[PDB]
Design a protein around this motif. Structure first.
Motif, PDB file in Angstrom:
ATOM      1  N   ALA A 249      52.842  38.948  41.084  1.00 49.23           N
ATOM      2  CA  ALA A 249      51.883  39.204  42.144  1.00 49.23           C
ATOM      3  C   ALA A 249      51.320  40.658  42.159  1.00 49.23           C
ATOM      4  O   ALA A 249      50.102  40.739  42.224  1.00 49.23           O
ATOM      5  N   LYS A 250      51.998  41.560  41.428  1.00 47.40           N
ATOM      6  CA  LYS A 250      51.349  42.831  41.018  1.00 47.40           C
ATOM      7  C   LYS A 250      50.217  42.717  40.099  1.00 47.40           C
ATOM      8  O   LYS A 250      49.148  43.180  40.350  1.00 47.40           O
ATOM      9  N   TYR A 251      50.293  41.854  38.830  1.00 42.61           N
ATOM     10  CA  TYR A 251      49.266  41.658  38.179  1.00 42.61           C
ATOM     11  C   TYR A 251      48.061  40.623  38.924  1.00 42.61           C
ATOM     12  O   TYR A 251      46.711  41.104  38.646  1.00 42.61           O
TER      13      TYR A 251
ATOM     14  N   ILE B  62      47.219  41.361  42.288  1.00 43.25           N
ATOM     15  CA  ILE B  62      46.758  42.130  42.859  1.00 43.25           C
ATOM     16  C   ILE B  62      45.856  43.144  41.919  1.00 43.25           C
ATOM     17  O   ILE B  62      44.527  43.472  42.655  1.00 43.25           O
ATOM     18  N   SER B  63      46.134  43.487  40.953  1.00 48.63           N
ATOM     19  CA  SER B  63      45.396  44.317  39.904  1.00 48.63           C
ATOM     20  C   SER B  63      43.940  43.525  39.752  1.00 48.63           C
ATOM     21  O   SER B  63      42.913  44.129  39.757  1.00 48.63           O
ATOM     22  N   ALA B  64      44.257  42.196  39.470  1.00 53.84           N
ATOM     23  CA  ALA B  64      43.148  41.510  39.089  1.00 53.84           C
ATOM     24  C   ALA B  64      42.182  41.135  40.191  1.00 53.84           C
ATOM     25  O   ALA B  64      40.976  41.443  39.954  1.00 53.84           O
ATOM     26  N   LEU B  65      42.516  41.187  41.535  1.00 59.09           N
ATOM     27  CA  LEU B  65      41.629  41.233  42.559  1.00 59.09           C
ATOM     28  C   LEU B  65      41.088  42.453  42.864  1.00 59.09           C
ATOM     29  O   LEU B  65      39.887  42.394  43.008  1.00 59.09           O
ATOM     30  N   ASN B  66      41.733  43.326  42.597  1.00 58.44           N
ATOM     31  CA  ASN B  66      41.232  44.939  42.805  1.00 58.44           C
ATOM     32  C   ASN B  66      39.860  44.885  41.849  1.00 58.44           C
ATOM     33  O   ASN B  66      38.893  45.547  42.186  1.00 58.44           O
ATOM     34  N   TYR B  67      40.104  44.265  40.477  1.00 61.08           N
ATOM     35  CA  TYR B  67      38.709  44.357  39.863  1.00 61.08           C
ATOM     36  C   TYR B  67      37.884  43.043  39.643  1.00 61.08           C
ATOM     37  O   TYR B  67      37.441  42.619  38.953  1.00 61.08           O
ATOM     38  N   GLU B  68      38.230  42.064  40.820  1.00 66.79           N
ATOM     39  CA  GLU B  68      37.347  40.967  41.176  1.00 66.79           C
ATOM     40  C   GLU B  68      37.585  39.794  39.981  1.00 66.79           C
ATOM     41  O   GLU B  68      36.593  38.998  39.659  1.00 66.79           O
ATOM     42  N   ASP B  69      38.582  39.941  39.440  1.00 71.95           N
ATOM     43  CA  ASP B  69      38.913  38.816  38.447  1.00 71.95           C
ATOM     44  C   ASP B  69      39.360  37.629  39.178  1.00 71.95           C
ATOM     45  O   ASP B  69      40.781  37.595  38.950  1.00 71.95           O
ATOM     46  N   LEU B  70      38.689  36.889  39.604  1.00 72.47           N
ATOM     47  CA  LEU B  70      39.315  35.822  40.609  1.00 72.47           C
ATOM     48  C   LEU B  70      40.236  34.631  39.615  1.00 72.47           C
ATOM     49  O   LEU B  70      41.244  34.441  40.220  1.00 72.47           O
TER      50      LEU B  70
ATOM     51  N   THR C 108      41.965  34.985  36.867  1.00 73.29           N
ATOM     52  CA  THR C 108      43.216  35.575  36.512  1.00 73.29           C
ATOM     53  C   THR C 108      44.095  35.707  37.821  1.00 73.29           C
ATOM     54  O   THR C 108      45.318  35.486  37.806  1.00 73.29           O
ATOM     55  N   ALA C 109      43.475  36.116  39.138  1.00 65.66           N
ATOM     56  CA  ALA C 109      44.223  36.131  40.136  1.00 65.66           C
ATOM     57  C   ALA C 109      44.712  34.771  40.597  1.00 65.66           C
ATOM     58  O   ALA C 109      46.134  34.696  40.858  1.00 65.66           O
ATOM     59  N   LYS C 110      44.260  33.684  40.233  1.00 68.88           N
ATOM     60  CA  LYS C 110      44.596  32.340  40.826  1.00 68.88           C
ATOM     61  C   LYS C 110      45.755  31.978  39.893  1.00 68.88           C
ATOM     62  O   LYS C 110      46.596  31.544  40.339  1.00 68.88           O
TER      63      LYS C 110
END
Ligand SMILES: Nc1ncnc2c1ncn2[C@@H]1O[C@H](COP(=O)(O)OP(=O)(O)OP(=O)(O)O)[C@@H](O)[C@H]1O
Ligand SMILES: Nc1ncnc2c1ncn2[C@@H]1O[C@H](COP(=O)(O)OP(=O)(O)OP(=O)(O)O)[C@@H](O)[C@H]1O
Lengths: 54, 319, 42, 319, 54
Positions: C13-15, C17-25, C27-29
């Motif tokens: 989840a943390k990962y 969140i980090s991904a989303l913080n850098y707009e890496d959709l 990865t977030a998915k």
């Protein structure tokens, strides 16, 4: 820079959605910290649905 | 028998105040021109002195007071009407006279009274009798300041000019409205707020965010700016993966937080990284977009209406 | 069976969140999907 | 002269506060992080000075204040708005100025002012003279040190944000809206309020409850919990008939109250039984159902309309 | 356990009925303290009939 008013407002809107997803994720994390599985599942699911819509 | 009331050296230049050039000009004519060339005020052009700054809160009226204080090199005395109201049960107003005396001894001098409306009116419980004589004292001092040769300047500040005692207004001279900043003033203020921070691309952004903030004050800008500043810090606070930026030509390897999909992405906590070898994310427009998001419209329009009313009614005529 | 898996979920989840913080959709998915699958596996 | 306010506090942790981790973040970032890594705030990025906490009563704003106070481990001062007003009608400001001085003395300090709206608004008598002058002095102090060099954080509290003086509004930083707790938060509160009593079936019951509980406050939740916790006592008080629990592993006999038909149902009074040798019934869900039935929703819907108005207008706001 | 949901309300209802019975019993007790047999016996009758309906 490719419509500095309209496109940027759309961008902001998307960022708001992303922000909401982040908040949901945080909520899920907190729920798990208290061993509250169904709520965490809900929050994660709702985040992922919005991700899938994006 | 001194009783020292605040004096200090602010460091706010003219250029740190963005916009209001017409007022600025007026003030340079209100303070500096008189001091530089006093002989220009023989005849029916007169050394104007009592000057009101009026308008909404948050517009750098205090900031302007600091600026002229920095810039004019004239003794700046800065006081609340609350300060030194009384000891007894008896005696006030002596301190007032002493203040006026000291300002006359320290020419050229400037008295700045913030929230002048704090002294007003005809109520009881003190104001009918006790602060009436204080009021009177004030009125007689400001009468005598115009008498003979002046080196003292009175600057008034108020958000609520309509609550300012009329008798003052009748005794009082020049009034200047301090409006909310316009597109240009907002834009410039942004640029001022950036300073050393990595400035992203061009003026187009500064003008855009200038336009997109409508009706907001200096303060309203500043909070948004500080929020945006804290955004990269937030980006550091939420961190697993980092990655090296600086090549071997630099003093050492320099690491910034990154997404898990990055190549060369090393994972730890921000606390694990040493302060110099940490590379804060740059400031993007999205940080400012979010700073906008954290600031909902700040404007109570009734106040604006009232200021317009006052502006139309008092200030045009001398009073 | 139930403790370290929760920790792993939290980490994912943390990962994300980090991904989303850098707009890496994407990865977030993928990270949210892994978190969810793992949660289902508990 | 001093008028002593205590700063030594109880142990209310971050984890005792359910929800709004973003507000928690803001608290940490405004207080702890600055103290931790001061070099973060060199140049143009500068710490928050003002935070308003608002919403309905009963939502742990005071609780949050205690939590921050536990976690920050710096001089935490907290005061009622009524406290330190005046004696002889007009002697008010000395204590105010001295207080701001005291904040300066022990940086980094934190001032908590409860119910800031009590020192606010405009009409007359107090807002002509005393509450006027005091409000004014407050205003001068709050931004006085706030901009440029600071070591104080001001935390306000209010249930009626819409009555907050415009001027004060613009002088003050960061609004945080405290919404009523959601499913998760309420569930967590239930888990906090489990105590030593055997928690019948899992946490699923708490999830159920959290869902069942709509619109209630922290205070409300606590009261219902208390109510359920008295039910076994009530039952004990009602019974004549008790029965032995004590298996052979225990030292002496151990008695719980029971129905008249029970195997070993002896009918003496609860007063006759010693504290250790009495076995209180465990807490089942029915006691909590009863608790819920007894305590009706405490919250009128008509406050939320004004709160929501404020939320739409200012809300999650910098100012 | 599988754990019901909609039956909780019914459980609450049954508890309300039981509460009512208890109230009736209390009133009967009160009325017997001053030897008002008719009042007490009507209340007891009510309690018993409704419990038979339960
Ligand atoms: N160029 C500028 N113009 C306006 N405001 C500024 C400028 N630069 C900084 N500020 C902000 O303005 C505030 C300074 O106080 P300010 O003079 O705005 O109060 P004020 O307008 O006198 O209000 P009040 O009359 O209620 O005291 C600070 O919070 C500061 O961050
Ligand atoms: N985790 C929690 N979250 C919210 N409230 C809690 C929590 N734990 C305990 N409380 C309750 O908080 C109450 C303390 O007062 P509280 O801080 O709620 O008032 P407030 O939020 O400052 O608003 P007001 O002063 O207007 O009531 C107690 O009644 C207590 O039961």
């Amino acid at each position: 820079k490719s419509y500095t008013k309209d496109e940027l407002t759309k961008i902001m809107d998307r960022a708001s959605k992303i922000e909401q997803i982040q908040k949901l994720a945080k909520y899920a994390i907190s729920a798990l910290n208290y061993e509250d599985l169904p709520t965490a599942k809900d929050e994660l699911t709702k985040a992922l649905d919005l991700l899938n819509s994006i | 028998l001194s009783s020292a009331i605040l004096s200090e050296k602010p460091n706010v230049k003219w250029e740190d105040v963005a916009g209001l050039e017409g007022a600025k000009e007026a003030l340079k004519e209100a303070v500096i021109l008189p001091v530089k060339f006093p002989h220009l005020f023989k005849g029916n052009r007169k050394p104007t002195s009592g000057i009101l700054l009026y308008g909404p809160p948050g517009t750098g009226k205090s900031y302007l007071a600091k600026a002229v204080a920095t810039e004019a090199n004239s003794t700046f005395f800065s006081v609340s009407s609350s300060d030194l109201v009384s000891k007894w049960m008896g005696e006030s107003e002596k301190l007032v006279k002493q203040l006026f005396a000291m300002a006359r001894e320290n020419k050229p001098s400037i008295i700045f009274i913030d929230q002048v409306d704090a002294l007003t009116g005809t109520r009881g419980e003190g104001e009918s009798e006790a602060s009436r004589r204080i009021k009177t004292e004030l009125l007689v001092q400001m009468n005598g300041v115009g008498n003979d040769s002046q080196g003292v300047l009175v600057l008034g500040a108020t958000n609520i000019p309509w609550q300012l005692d009329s008798a003052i207004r009748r005794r009082f001279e020049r009034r200047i409205y301090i409006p909310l900043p316009d597109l240009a003033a907002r834009t410039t203020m942004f640029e001022i707020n950036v300073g050393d921070t990595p400035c992203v691309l061009t003026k187009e952004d500064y003008r855009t965010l200038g336009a997109m903030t409508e009706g907001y004050s200096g303060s309203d800008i500043a909070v948004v700016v500080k929020d945006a500043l804290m955004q990269p810090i937030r980006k550091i606070q939420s961190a697993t993966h980092f990655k090296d930026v600086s090549t071997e030509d630099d003093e050492t390897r320099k690491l910034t937080p990154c997404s898990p999909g990055d190549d060369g992405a090393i994972e730890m906590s921000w606390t694990d990284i040493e302060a110099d070898e940490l590379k804060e994310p740059d400031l993007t427009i999205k940080d400012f977009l979010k700073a906008i998001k954290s600031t909902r419209p700040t404007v109570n329009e009734d106040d604006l209406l009232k200021q317009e009313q006052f502006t139309r009614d008092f200030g045009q005529e001398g009073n």
